[PDB]
């Protein structure tokens, strides 16, 4: 089997991407944030505290003939940005782009933090990291990808995120028309439950490539590119007037700037992030100070190749017995 679904930015900044997902019988379609940095499929639901719902589409398990309470199971998750959600669990039929999993754990939110409530466009998350990070207790549950894997033509999914444009998540096949050149594959460590890999270095604009190992995660659920302070300083030093602002919470730059590109290494290959991808616009409406898309990972504890990086590439998440990650230009 295979599946193919379009993913769409939620706003003009590509803050996140939503992909339609069919849950239950008859289908209830919710727009979920596919997140390769976590492993819970959770939804706004008929159980979510009413005051914490503001425009989201909800899953109502009582209206699904295939929903079953997973008795005794609860879940609770906290994300890198400080947001959180928790609730109980149903199993139900879940389909993405024509690919169907029966008996998928669908985690129903009883509570969500303010950032989720305030984002009317995101109806929940679909985790695509390794199932060892799943938060369901007392019986840990599998991701949609893990459940689908055996049925897939090939044990892979691909992320093809757009810059200010729709893109695609595919399951079970590599679309050879969706990228240019060849795909370069690189080793993955699953020790922390993430798609964790080591970049071979970087360049700033037209500058020389610096060979240096940068361990980090491929995380579609994180907006920006978070890298070591040394690397980030080298980037922003090339932008007149750029500075790190503790009051704003990262690097800002004059909105009048033209940003240089940023290149990262994948083995001997190179992925180029155009300068425009690094512009996240005015810090507040009408400001001439703009927020940077490359930020320091210092104090996160991990480097994160978020959407800013991944949208510059066609990315293969290879869930073979020895997982790997593939990157191609596009």
Planar angle of CA 71, 72, 73, nearest 5 degrees: 95
Q: How far, in Å, are 23, 40, 187, 208 from residue 71 at the CA level?
A: 19, 17, 38, 58
Token pair for residue 110?
Answer: 């009883």
Token pair for residue 105?
Answer: 């754990």
DSSP letter, residue 248: T
**HSE-up of residue 29 (Cα within 13 Å, Cβ side):** 7
Dist. CA 10–CA 6, nearest whole Å: 13
Active site residue 86: no
- Helix (H/G/I), strand (E/B), else coil: 52: helix
Q: Which of 64, 108, 199, 261 is catalytic?
A: 199
- Phi and psi at residue 149, to the nearest 5°: -50, -50
Strand partners, 168: 6, 160
Residues whose CB is less than 8 angstroms from the CB of residue 72 and which lie 6 or more positions away in sequence, other chains included: 138
Residues whose CB is less than 8 angstroms from the CB of residue 208 and which lie 6 or more positions away in sequence, other chains included: none
Beta carbons of 164 and 157 less than 8 angstroms apart = no
| Cα dihedral across residues 302, 307, 310, 316: positive or negative | positive
Q: Considering only CA atoms, which of 244, 10, 252, 30 is closest in space to residue 126? A: 30
- The data reach a resolution, in angstroms, of 1.4
Tell me the CATH number for domain 5-174.
2.40.70.10
- Taking phi over 0 as left and psi of -120 to 50 as alpha, with beta for the rest, 182 belongs to beta
Q: Which of 33, 35, 40, 279 is catalytic?
A: 35
The second-level CATH assignment, the architecture, of 175-330 is Beta Barrel (2.40)
**Using what technique was this structure determined?**
X-ray
Beta carbons of 158 and 122 less than 8 angstroms apart = no
Domain(s) of CATH 2.40.70.10: residues in the chain: 5-174, 175-330
Active site residue 15: no
Dist. CA 129–CA 167, nearest whole Å: 20
Dist. CA 194–CA 224, nearest whole Å: 17
- Phi and psi at residue 234, to the nearest 5°: -60, -40
Taking residue 209's Cβ as centre, other Cβ atoms within 10 Å add up to 14
- Phi and psi at residue 174, to the nearest 5°: -105, 115
């Amino acid at each position: 089997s295979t599946g193919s679904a379009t993913t769409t930015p939620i706003d003009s900044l590509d803050d996140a991407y939503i992909t339609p997902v069919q849950i239950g019988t008859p289908a209830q379609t919710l727009n979920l944030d596919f997140d390769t940095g976590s492993s819970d499929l959770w939804v706004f639901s008929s159980e979510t505290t009413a005051s914490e719902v503001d425009g989201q589409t909800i899953y109502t398990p009582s209206k699904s003939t295939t929903a079953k309470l997973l008795s005794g199971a609860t879940w609770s998750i906290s994300y890198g940005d400080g947001s959180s959600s928790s609730g109980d669990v149903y199993t139900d039929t879940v389909s993405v782009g024509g690919l169907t999993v029966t008996g998928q754990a669908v985690e129903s939110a009883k509570k969500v933090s303010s950032s989720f409530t305030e984002d009317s466009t995101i109806d929940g998350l679909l985790g695509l990291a390794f199932s060892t990070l799943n938060t369901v207790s007392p019986t840990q549950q599998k991701t949609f990808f893990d459940n689908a894997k055996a049925s897939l033509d090939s044990p892979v999914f691909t992320a093809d995120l757009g810059y200010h444009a729709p893109g695609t998540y595919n399951f079970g096949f590599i679309d050879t028309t969706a990228y240019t050149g060849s795909i370069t594959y690189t080793a993955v460590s699953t020790k922390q439950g993430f798609w964790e890999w080591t970049s071979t270095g970087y360049a700033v604009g037209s500058g020389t490539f610096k060979s240096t190992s940068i361990d980090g995660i491929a995380d579609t659920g994180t907006t920006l590119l978070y890298l070591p302070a040394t690397v980030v300083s080298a980037y922003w030093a090339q932008v007149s007037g750029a500075k790190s602002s503790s009051s704003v919470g990262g690097y800002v730059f004059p909105c009048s700037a033209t940003l240089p590109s940023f290149t990262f290494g994948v083995g001997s290959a190179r992925i180029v992030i155009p300068g425009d991808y690094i512009d996240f616009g005015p810090i507040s409406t009408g400001s001439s100070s703009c927020f940077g898309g490359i930020q320091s990972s210092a104090g996160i504890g991990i480097n994160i190749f978020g959407d800013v990086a991944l949208k510059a590439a066609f990315v293969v998440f290879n869930g073979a017995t020895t997982p790997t990650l593939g990157f191609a230009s596009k």
